[PDB]
């Protein structure tokens, strides 16, 4: 499903407003993108479904550090 | 193209950048390079544009330092005001005879002052005095019952100003030989009067730029 593998961002629900404030249910989905991240230690490309906000944290945290937290959650690669 | 006289003028002043009053007045004193004594020529640009009728400004200011610019005063008045005008030093005082002298072409005066009763006679001179801007106007204080004061107030260094179509102010604070400190006071006194004259609707910086120049001198910006 539409879940970020780094930040865990998932679709959330809200209201479409209007000039009359009429509220209709809607969904907010993350800005997810499938990207192939280069992991130096394995000298390989690993593809991750990440949000645009997740991309920013990868530079700040390091490619190895973020993957270590994902392994704590436990998943396939 | 440019001669040596003109090139040294622009070499002394670099007008591409702004200058402060202290520096500007120093530059003005070094720009006085002419055979005859020069007069400071004001070059102040107003953000407000006279293209709107109601935004026009007419004003007057008496300067203690003075300018030196000829101040021969012709006065249109009768009775006690004629004696008071003569006692105040008016060079010419009369009514119909002086108006007819003006019609005959005797224009040996620089400033006309009229009493409101004399406006009937001065109105006939509108074809002559109007195009030259010599016509007395109440908004500049040259139409007053206190004729003696208007003759006084003038004489020394009373200066006039009227906005043009391009919304620019071209007055004269005084002669170039005047001391820098006095000239700074002269322009400063002028500047406060302009602030009072400013209207309200004008949604723009009252002054678009302040510059000073002499007869052949370059324009130095004032800050």
């Amino acid at each position: 499903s539409r879940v970020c593998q780094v930040t865990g961002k998932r679709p959330v629900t809200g209201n479409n407003r209007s000039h009359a404030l009429n509220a209709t249910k809607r969904r907010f989905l993350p800005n997810l993108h499938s990207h192939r991240f280069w992991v130096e230690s394995e000298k390989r490309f690993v593809t991750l479904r990440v949000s645009a906000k997740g991309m920013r944290v990868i530079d700040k945290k390091g490619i190895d550090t973020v993957l270590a937290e994902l392994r704590a959650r436990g998943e396939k690669y | 193209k440019l001669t040596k006289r003109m090139r040294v003028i622009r070499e002394k002043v670099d007008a591409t950048k702004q200058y402060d009053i202290n520096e500007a007045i120093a530059l003005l004193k070094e720009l006085a390079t002419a055979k005859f004594v020069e007069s400071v020529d004001v070059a102040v640009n107003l953000g407000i544009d006279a293209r709107k009728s109601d935004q026009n400004v007419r004003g007057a200011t008496v300067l203690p330092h003075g300018t030196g610019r000829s101040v021969r005063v012709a006065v249109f008045t009768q009775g006690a005001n004629a004696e008071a005008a003569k006692a105040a030093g008016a060079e010419l005082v009369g009514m119909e005879d002086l108006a007819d002298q003006i019609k005959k072409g005797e224009m040996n005066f620089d400033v006309v002052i009229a009493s409101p009763d004399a406006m009937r006679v001065v109105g006939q001179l509108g074809q002559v005095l109007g195009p030259r801007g010599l016509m007395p106007n109440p908004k500049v204080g040259t139409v007053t019952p206190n004729v003696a004061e208007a003759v006084k107030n003038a004489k020394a260094g009373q200066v006039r100003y009227r906005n043009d179509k391009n919304g620019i102010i071209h007055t004269t604070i005084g002669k170039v030989d005047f001391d820098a400190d006095k000239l700074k006071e002269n322009l400063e006194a002028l500047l406060v009067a302009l602030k009072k004259a400013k209207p309200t609707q004008a949604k723009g910086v009252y002054i678009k730029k302040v510059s000073i120049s002499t007869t052949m001198g370059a324009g130095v910006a004032v800050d």
Binding site: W38, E40, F45, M55, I58, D59 | -
Partner: protein, 149 residues
């Protein structure tokens, strides 16, 4: 996205030059191709450490260069003899082989290559001025006395 260069990528500079550059550029190109590494505190200290390491290496190779230099520069004149060369017509030359051993004197070894013999191949007999180049910037000097057999 601060990153420390590892080579002379385009106009960014040369190896070892931290420069500010748009995130995407390095996030996917410099690093997955190995052309650079983020100049992060941790990485930058290692970088500067390696830098200073090689810097002290250069210092030593040039420090030990002046060592060899002085060792043989100050006098250290040689007078080894070999073939039937005497005076007048010194007959044969002294070349890379014998000369190296001479100045070495079983000690100050100077490679036969460095034995830069400027004045031809030193055929005439007499005082001769021979220089050595222990290091590229070091300009060493030696005097050689040739004597008969």
């Amino acid at each position: 996205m601060q990153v420390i260069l590892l080579d002379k990528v385009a106009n960014l500079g040369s190896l070892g030059d931290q420069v500010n550059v748009k995130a995407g550029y390095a996030r996917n190109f410099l690093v997955p191709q190995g052309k650079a590494v983020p100049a992060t505190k941790k990485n930058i200290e290692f970088f500067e450490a390696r830098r200073a390491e090689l810097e002290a290496k250069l210092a030593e190779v040039l420090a030990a260069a002046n060592a060899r230099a002085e060792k043989i520069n100050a006098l250290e004149t040689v007078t080894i003899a070999s073939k039937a060369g005497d005076e007048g017509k010194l007959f044969g030359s002294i070349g890379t082989r014998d000369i190296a051993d001479a100045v070495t004197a079983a000690g100050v070894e100077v490679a036969k290559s460095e034995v830069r013999l400027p004045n031809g191949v030193l055929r005439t007999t007499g005082e001769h001025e021979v220089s050595f180049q222990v290091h590229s910037e070091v300009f060493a000097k030696v005097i050689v006395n040739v004597v008969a057999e």
